[model samples]
Target: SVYDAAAQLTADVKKDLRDSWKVIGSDKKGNGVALMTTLFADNQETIGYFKRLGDVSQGMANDKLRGHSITLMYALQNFIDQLDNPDDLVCVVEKLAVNHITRKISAAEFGKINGPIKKVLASKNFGDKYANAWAKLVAVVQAAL
Candidate 1:
């Protein structure tokens, strides 16, 4: 189905989204922190820019790196929380998109993280409906970017 944030997520889907994120980000070890860890592993070039976050090779041990992971999770929480009003959601997404673009981050660069994101989230709910729900939300943000 076509998605633009304003539409496509019915009440049930929204509920699923909230529930899934609660679990996906419930633990840094298996979720957000793990995501950045694997993302950098799969794409070492990511560290080229992410170096500003702190020591790229330190993985979860790096304070800035872990902090960014938590922030990343919270960012998506904002996205889900605002979904009821698509107008605001799009604006929010736009603001986030701008942040990345100005950093010389290409939309394609966003694509690179999907694999790691899926892997990390799947570690928690690989084949469950919860996993599928997360994918849809990801697509909305991805398409928006």
Candidate 2:
């Protein structure tokens, strides 16, 4: 029942997220900077993983911020597109987890990212309905990891 709910919520938010991606495409770099800014400001530990970012002192215009932002956004697009395939989705997430592990990333540290990532998708105003739904889906994802 819970998994069903998560799936439903994910489906409900899918279109809106996809629509946002259309606009984000126009400024992938800026959008990526915004997402990273939120992630970094919300959780300082994020800095450690973005070594290419050099330092927050470099600000949002840094080359690495733009590059990583584009990279992460594309990855999110892929994950969103595959949410319907439970097995496939799990496989993708598993691959990511394994890669992160190689980089010494803990599950807790990795999971902490779901929040800022979600905020980016929701644009900070997805409403309670979408927020709850997104949270359910993310919980399911975290469990799978």
Candidate 3:
């Protein structure tokens, strides 16, 4: 009998993600602002994503930045919560993926955020061992997008 392909996502990716969740994971709000603010500052093209989410006063994205970031992290926390459940994970990825096609999100602008995520994790110290975890995460989603 032929074997089932059985899986789509790799096992290490799930393991790596679960491992990262254990890496002193505690600062959601602070890290949330750090994550979003870094993306906005690093890539105006990313901040340019504003009209899609909100306003863009040239770079006034910072003013209400704190507000959006909190909820963003709140939502992010929800997503991470489901890491063990690949079906739901893929569920959202595909949903976001469908819309990403509509928004014309290029690999480049999508990639721009990847750099800061790694750097932020690195900045937080535990990233010394866990950075590659995020790289795999972004690569998979980017491929989907």
Candidate 4:
């Protein structure tokens, strides 16, 4: 059953992300701001995590947010690319979790991010199935954290 879930998650997340590539590429910054806005709005306390993002609205001009967004986009793309390799996926997710942990981010926070991320992805027509798959992947990441 784990294998089936993994296979399904890989297929669904990859296909939907691939299909939405154009939309993600169209405006990385705007989309990044949208995600950050939702995250901060949902849990204001998370705002304290990003020292510079105190005024989340200014994320548009913030280099940290822009770079983080680009990094996030590439990370998702990379995850899709590595889906067939469980070892690689584990490494990627672990590295991300470590990075967050080092920054004082909690596992729960990582899991919480799924809401806004799913909303943003779904808004681009990625669909519920893909969003659900993405949630599964993020759950794995949270567990690893």
Candidate 5:
């Protein structure tokens, strides 16, 4: 249910910005965009993750800063692993959302961690644009349910 809710609430995030369309490889063959798209697709979850944070910079996890991406992920993972009730889950997500709205996180650091994950996923054929899109798209699904 939480997953569903998170998906819905994040729809407006990145509703207009172009995809994280940067090319991390050579373009000599003119497949740079294609490569990036592949990379984007393979690591869809990770890339759109940062994108989602960027898109919803005002309502997620701003303890010391908004979108402390990795930290928030770790925090959520850590909480979920031991958390047993729906109330606890709601509390955690709500708390993190409020925190993000209140401060700012190091976007640069988030990118650093996010990039490698994308790179690896792309290389391994795991990244996909749709995946990234789906990852961000979940925000809307989660919120609406």
Candidate 6:
């Protein structure tokens, strides 16, 4: 039932972001931060979703090369927090993954935000175990939501 737990947690996180979501631009490095704290009170599942998504940064704010890493992190975390079930999160993730990769977002670019990315996901309180988990699970999160 680990997948169920992960899915549940992802849903909690998605709910918060959906309530206060915003998109400044399509760039990978934009400086937009959604107000996730509005509904993210003591939900670990929501928090975990944030931790998982905190690091997908935008590359060059105000430019075309916005850091998809952080923005996607914000979007993904926000989406997951708002969902009532795993299906919702999974659907979103699948769409996003396709959009980014289809637009030629490289794997290296994806790897660029790992440090701050992991921080955001792990409450900015990075731990080796969680980091490891993030490394592994984020891909799955992307694929399965």
Model 1, span 1-145: residue lDDT tens:
2145457767887888777677775774547788888888889888888868878578678888888888888788788788788777777777787788777877678877777866866676555565566666666656656
Instruction: Evaluate model 3: give its lDDT.
Output: 0.60
Give one digit per residue, the lDDT tens place, for model 3 in 44-122.
6666656654653423245466566666665446546766666666666566556667889865556676666776777
Point out where model 6 deviates above 4 Å: 1-73, 82-84, 106-116, 119-123, 141-145
lDDT of 4: 0.71
Q: Rate the local accuracy (lDDT) of all candidates.
A: 0.73, 0.63, 0.60, 0.71, 0.38, 0.42
In terms of lDDT, the poorest run of 10 residues in model 2 is 1-10
The candidate with the higher TM-score, 3 or 6, is 3
lDDT of 6 by residue, 45-81 (tens): 3344334345323223323223433555566555435
Residue lDDT tens for model 5, 7-96: 332333233112222222222122323333343455565454345434333332332223243343355343333233435555565565
| Stretches of candidate 3 exceeding 4 Å from the true structure | 1-13, 22-25, 51-63
In candidate 1, how many Å is residue 7 off?
2.2
Alpha-carbon RMSD to native, per candidate:
2.8, 3.8, 4.9, 3.0, 14.1, 11.6
Give residue 43's error in model 3 in angstroms: 2.1
Worst 10 residues of 4 by lDDT: 1-10
Error of 1 at 10 (Å): 4.0
Top-lDDT structure, candidate number: 1
Ranking the candidates on TM-score from highest down gives: 1, 4, 2, 3, 6, 5
Q: Return the top candidate by TM-score.
A: 1
